[PDB]
Amino acid sequence: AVIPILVIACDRSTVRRCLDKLLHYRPSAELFPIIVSQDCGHEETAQVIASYGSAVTHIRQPDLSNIAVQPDHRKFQGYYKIARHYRWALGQIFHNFNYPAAVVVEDDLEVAPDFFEYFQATYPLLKADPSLWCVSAWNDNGKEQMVDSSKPELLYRTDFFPGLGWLLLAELWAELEPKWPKAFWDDWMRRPEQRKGRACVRPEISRTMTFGRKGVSHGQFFDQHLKFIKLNQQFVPFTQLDLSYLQQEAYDRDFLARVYGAPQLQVEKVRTNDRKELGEVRVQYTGRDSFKAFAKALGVMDDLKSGVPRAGYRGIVTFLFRGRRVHLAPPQTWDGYDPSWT
Ligand SMILES: CC(=O)N[C@@H]1[C@@H](O)[C@H](O)[C@@H](CO)O[C@@H]1CP(=O)(O)OP(=O)(O)OC[C@H]1O[C@@H](n2ccc(=O)[nH]c2=O)[C@H](O)[C@@H]1O
Ligand SMILES: [Mn+2]
């Protein structure tokens, strides 16, 4: 199966950093053709992409007109342009080139040495399990002190769509295109009407890292969070590993049994590093306020999209804190997300 890498670009010449790493690590030009879709028309960026010659296929979004935004969105024209470009580019991949799947990579992402190996290994899982709707290279809680460097091979399921280096099947584009939004496509994906209870595979250590401090947005989120996401540098031969543990049946039984079988500790004890003999614990939250309070106390992301926490799975956020494995989890009676948890 051929899995193209669709690179989304606009007006940053640093797309060079992105393409250099993709081309350096690519194991096969035939199995992983690179298609660079460029919006905007920025001449210098176009010349940079063109300089790679036949190593990539350069396509150009055709409609460079301004978009009529709704009354609440005067400040957000750029987000409307991002959504328009995604719809056109994905249409080229799935309707024109007619590929079976694709890995979407924004121009300000640097990939890890095992980026291709990771997607090659997980594609069959995505094809076989309809409860999965994507595979992502991104760990939303992937800061250095929050991940286990001794387990670069460990993967998880997450209900929180991460994007930022992600694989989708042509089958999913068939479902999304007819209702593609005018703006904020990532948060639109995160809504239950789109997600329909499906999960993505995500890693313990991220296979992408963004360097786009300057972009469409204000550098706030980048400066406070994104810049700290660690890029994996230890090559893991995922295609040689047994990933059967990620199938829904196995995961929902074993991973959940692991989380709820682990000893419970009060957040304060985890914070101060008490009871260190307990290498894996559960910190229970019971409502929106306690979730946010406990997430912040332990240094993890505390925002929610449609009621789902960053990297959460059945409400559980899993990470490392001062060397200890911690599962910030709801009571075992959990039965669905509440979008009102904002
Ligand atoms: C870290 C993070 O979560 N970033 C997400 C991004 O993944 C997502 O797609 C976007 C959806 O609203 O929200 C932010 C944007 P954010 O990450 O803040 O901003 P940017 O990198 O500038 O833009 C995202 C992508 O859109 C492209 N672009 C930009 C301007 C334009 O007119 N046309 C165009 O196609 C860029 O080349 C880039 O590939
Ligand atoms: Mn960006």
Side-chain angles (χ1 to χ4, degrees):
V2 184
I3 303 170
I5 306 304
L6 171 64
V7 177
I8 305 298
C10 168
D11 57 6
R12 290 184 293 207
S13 69
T14 49
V15 60
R16 176 188 296 284
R17 174 170 169 183
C18 173
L19 294 176
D20 285 349
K21 289 290 179 292
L22 282 166
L23 290 162
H24 178 69
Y25 294 131
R26 178 166 68 168
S28 168
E30 290 186 301
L31 293 188
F32 297 103
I34 294 162
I35 303 303
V36 184
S37 187
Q38 193 202 349
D39 189 15
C40 312
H42 190 264
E43 190 55 38
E44 182 173 355
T45 296
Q47 297 173 334
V48 171
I49 298 165
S51 76
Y52 286 81
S54 69
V56 306
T57 295
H58 186 194
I59 65 177
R60 305 177 188 210
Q61 200 279 112
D63 179 8
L64 299 184
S65 64
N66 287 321
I67 301 170
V69 304
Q70 283 294 111
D72 52 333
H73 294 160
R74 269 84 203 203
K75 296 164 61 168
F76 306 111
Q77 170 82 197
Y79 295 98
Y80 277 67
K81 287 185 174 182
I82 291 171
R84 172 174 65 186
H85 187 197
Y86 265 70
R87 173 161 176 168
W88 184 79
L90 287 165
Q92 289 293 301
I93 289 296
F94 295 120
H95 302 319
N96 182 8
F97 291 92
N98 192 40
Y99 287 114
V103 180
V104 184
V105 179
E106 287 179 339
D107 69 306
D108 61 359
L109 303 184
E110 174 169 330
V111 303
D114 52 6
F115 172 90
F116 297 90
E117 175 80 14
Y118 173 61
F119 285 112
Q120 184 164 267
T122 54
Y123 173 63
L125 182 64
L126 183 60
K127 284 186 300 178
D129 189 349
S131 68
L132 288 176
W133 77 331
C134 102
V135 177
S136 173
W138 191 262
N139 177 356
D140 279 279
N141 288 312
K143 299 182 188 178
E144 189 156 49
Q145 298 305 304
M146 311 193 296
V147 304
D148 186 352
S149 59
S150 80
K151 287 296 292 182
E153 75 276 26
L154 184 60
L155 306 178
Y156 300 82
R157 287 173 73 97
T158 178
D159 287 320
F160 191 97
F161 172 69
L164 300 170
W166 58 291
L167 171 72
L168 77 161
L169 304 181
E171 287 84 338
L172 178 61
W173 186 237
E175 181 178 344
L176 303 178
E177 187 179 16
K179 55 174 177 173
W180 195 252
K182 294 185 174 188
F184 315 122
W185 73 269
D186 51 354
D187 283 355
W188 172 85
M189 284 288 277
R190 293 163 179 154
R191 294 173 177 181
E193 311 94 84
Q194 275 58 261
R195 193 173 76 79
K196 300 176 188 176
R198 295 170 292 190
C200 290
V201 169
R202 67 86 181 174
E204 170 75 6
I205 311 188
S206 303
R207 262 59 187 193
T208 47
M209 168 272 289
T210 188
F211 53 79
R213 181 169 188 259
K214 167 65 186 68
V216 169
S217 178
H218 306 305
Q220 168 183 48
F221 191 38
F222 180 89
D223 285 345
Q224 294 195 301
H225 181 68
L226 307 167
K227 70 177 291 177
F228 302 110
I229 298 296
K230 173 180 196 175
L231 185 61
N232 177 59
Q233 288 302 321
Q234 192 183 324
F235 186 92
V236 170
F238 290 103
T239 65
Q240 301 185 342
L241 309 182
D242 186 339
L243 305 186
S244 68
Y245 72 96
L246 291 165
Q247 303 174 309
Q248 196 175 55
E249 52 267 46
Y251 202 88
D252 285 0
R253 176 189 65 251
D254 297 340
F255 189 73
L256 273 286
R258 181 188 195 99
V259 169
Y260 289 102
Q264 200 179 308
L265 277 188
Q266 299 311 69
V267 69
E268 298 69 31
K269 292 185 181 182
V270 176
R271 268 177 63 79
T272 53
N273 226 22
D274 291 302
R275 306 289 299 293
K276 295 185 66 174
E277 68 270 19
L278 304 183
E280 183 159 355
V281 304
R282 179 165 42 89
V283 173
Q284 173 174 292
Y285 64 84
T286 53
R288 188 273 296 181
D289 296 335
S290 54
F291 168 75
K292 283 194 178 179
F294 298 173
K296 180 185 172 185
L298 299 181
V300 293
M301 292 197 78
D302 64 321
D303 70 323
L304 303 126
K305 295 294 181 169
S306 291
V308 185
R310 296 268 174 186
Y313 188 66
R314 294 188 69 81
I316 307 160
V317 180
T318 298
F319 57 98
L320 224 59
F321 186 79
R322 305 186 66 180
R324 162 156 44 200
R325 175 59 65 193
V326 177
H327 301 291
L328 174 56
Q332 194 169 47
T333 53
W334 187 88
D335 196 14
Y337 293 104
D338 185 345
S340 74
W341 280 38
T342 55

XYZ file of all heavy atoms in Angstrom, residues 8-10 12 39-40 79 81-82 85-86 106-108 164 184-186 215-217 226, ligand 1:
225
model
N 1.450 20.364 4.205
C 0.639 21.585 4.064
C 1.541 22.809 4.272
O 2.152 22.964 5.339
C -0.489 21.591 5.115
C -1.334 20.313 5.025
C -1.336 22.882 4.955
C -2.048 20.128 3.687
N 1.652 23.655 3.251
C 2.513 24.837 3.320
C 1.805 26.113 2.876
O 0.727 26.065 2.273
C 3.777 24.600 2.467
N 2.431 27.249 3.169
C 1.856 28.536 2.805
C 2.926 29.586 2.535
O 3.322 29.771 1.384
C 0.878 28.988 3.904
S 0.263 30.717 3.895
N 5.962 30.159 4.795
C 7.146 30.022 5.644
C 8.231 29.235 4.894
O 8.036 28.071 4.514
C 6.792 29.316 6.966
C 5.920 30.174 7.901
C 5.658 29.503 9.248
N 4.826 28.303 9.106
C 4.023 27.821 10.056
N 3.926 28.422 11.245
N 3.305 26.732 9.811
N -0.522 26.764 -0.230
C -1.579 27.775 -0.304
C -0.829 29.110 -0.348
O 0.412 29.149 -0.354
C -2.436 27.683 0.972
C -3.704 28.531 0.922
O -4.104 28.979 -0.171
O -4.316 28.723 2.000
N -1.585 30.202 -0.442
C -1.008 31.542 -0.337
C -0.260 32.161 -1.513
O -0.484 33.324 -1.824
C -0.155 31.563 0.951
S -1.092 30.861 2.379
N -7.860 31.225 9.830
C -8.399 29.894 10.133
C -9.370 29.415 9.049
O -9.495 28.210 8.803
C -9.054 29.883 11.519
C -8.043 30.110 12.629
C -7.859 31.375 13.191
C -7.235 29.060 13.082
C -6.882 31.594 14.179
C -6.266 29.267 14.065
C -6.097 30.533 14.604
O -5.131 30.742 15.568
N -8.931 30.185 5.907
C -8.035 29.793 4.813
C -7.422 28.411 5.078
O -7.302 27.608 4.147
C -6.942 30.842 4.616
C -7.510 32.114 3.953
C -6.459 33.157 3.620
C -7.119 34.304 2.842
N -6.165 35.363 2.417
N -7.072 28.123 6.336
C -6.523 26.805 6.662
C -7.577 25.730 6.312
O -7.256 24.739 5.650
C -6.137 26.707 8.173
C -4.932 27.611 8.476
C -5.833 25.245 8.544
C -4.626 27.742 9.962
N -7.899 25.233 2.537
C -6.746 24.532 1.977
C -6.803 23.044 2.297
O -6.562 22.218 1.423
C -5.441 25.131 2.493
C -4.224 24.568 1.820
N -2.962 24.701 2.349
C -4.074 23.892 0.652
C -2.082 24.130 1.540
N -2.730 23.635 0.501
N -7.105 22.689 3.545
C -7.224 21.275 3.904
C -8.246 20.564 3.018
O -7.984 19.457 2.535
C -7.636 21.111 5.372
C -6.485 20.910 6.325
C -5.598 21.952 6.619
C -6.260 19.658 6.908
C -4.503 21.743 7.472
C -5.174 19.444 7.767
C -4.305 20.487 8.032
O -3.201 20.270 8.834
N 2.053 19.249 8.733
C 2.161 20.695 8.510
C 3.632 21.107 8.336
O 4.554 20.444 8.844
C 1.445 21.446 9.650
C -0.081 21.274 9.453
C -0.950 21.923 10.504
O -0.476 22.190 11.631
O -2.146 22.152 10.195
N 3.845 22.194 7.600
C 5.183 22.680 7.252
C 6.120 23.024 8.386
O 7.331 23.164 8.159
C 5.060 23.892 6.307
C 4.499 25.122 6.996
O 3.413 25.015 7.609
O 5.159 26.192 6.916
N 5.569 23.200 9.589
C 6.376 23.526 10.756
C 6.565 22.354 11.711
O 6.782 22.549 12.905
C 5.792 24.738 11.503
C 4.393 24.497 12.022
O 3.837 23.396 11.793
O 3.850 25.416 12.688
N -1.447 16.923 14.135
C 0.008 17.163 14.154
C 0.853 15.944 13.767
O 1.660 15.435 14.548
C 0.395 17.731 15.547
C -0.317 19.065 15.885
C -0.079 19.442 17.344
C 0.202 20.169 14.956
N -11.670 26.239 11.935
C -11.329 25.477 13.148
C -11.603 23.993 12.978
O -12.255 23.356 13.820
C -12.104 26.018 14.370
C -12.114 27.531 14.473
C -13.308 28.227 14.489
C -10.923 28.244 14.521
C -13.310 29.618 14.543
C -10.910 29.627 14.578
C -12.115 30.316 14.586
N -11.038 23.426 11.913
C -11.294 22.029 11.594
C -10.848 21.036 12.655
O -11.458 19.978 12.800
C -10.698 21.654 10.216
C -9.193 21.551 10.215
C -8.299 22.548 9.948
C -8.422 20.416 10.640
N -7.009 22.111 10.199
C -7.063 20.811 10.628
C -8.749 19.107 11.043
C -6.023 19.948 11.013
C -7.717 18.249 11.431
C -6.369 18.682 11.412
N -9.799 21.371 13.405
C -9.323 20.469 14.450
C -10.316 20.342 15.611
O -10.647 19.228 16.037
C -7.919 20.882 14.955
C -7.816 22.347 15.358
O -8.768 23.138 15.168
O -6.741 22.716 15.872
N 3.170 31.920 13.210
C 2.246 31.318 12.263
C 0.956 32.108 12.261
O 0.959 33.317 12.495
N -0.154 31.427 12.009
C -1.449 32.083 11.975
C -1.878 32.614 13.329
O -2.549 33.650 13.412
C -2.524 31.108 11.466
C -3.928 31.690 11.672
C -2.276 30.814 9.996
N -1.484 31.917 14.389
C -1.881 32.304 15.732
C -0.881 33.176 16.443
O 0.148 33.558 15.898
C -2.124 31.063 16.587
O -2.466 31.416 17.921
N 3.595 24.031 23.475
C 4.122 23.289 22.334
C 5.627 23.167 22.226
O 6.133 22.101 21.851
C 3.563 23.863 21.025
C 2.042 23.999 20.928
C 1.704 24.857 19.725
C 1.374 22.624 20.822
C -0.162 23.329 17.110
C -1.548 23.295 16.538
O -2.442 22.722 17.167
N -1.753 23.893 15.348
C -3.103 23.893 14.744
C -3.017 23.367 13.312
O -2.508 22.021 13.291
C -4.427 23.359 12.666
O -4.445 22.971 11.281
C -5.100 24.737 12.760
C -6.616 24.563 12.526
O -7.314 25.824 12.661
O -5.008 25.218 14.125
C -3.639 25.341 14.620
C -2.917 26.337 13.713
P -1.264 26.937 13.985
O -0.226 25.867 14.110
O -1.249 27.864 15.169
O -0.743 27.809 12.778
P 0.010 27.536 11.344
O 1.094 26.548 11.590
O 0.420 28.857 10.836
O -1.019 26.977 10.276
C -1.397 25.604 10.213
C -1.200 25.103 8.784
O -2.077 25.870 7.898
C -1.341 26.338 6.775
N -1.948 27.582 6.255
C -1.780 28.775 6.959
C -2.292 29.905 6.535
C -3.052 29.937 5.306
O -3.571 30.923 4.808
N -3.194 28.695 4.635
C -2.677 27.497 5.051
O -2.841 26.460 4.424
C 0.104 26.387 7.206
O 0.969 26.262 6.073
C 0.199 25.191 8.174
O 0.518 23.959 7.483
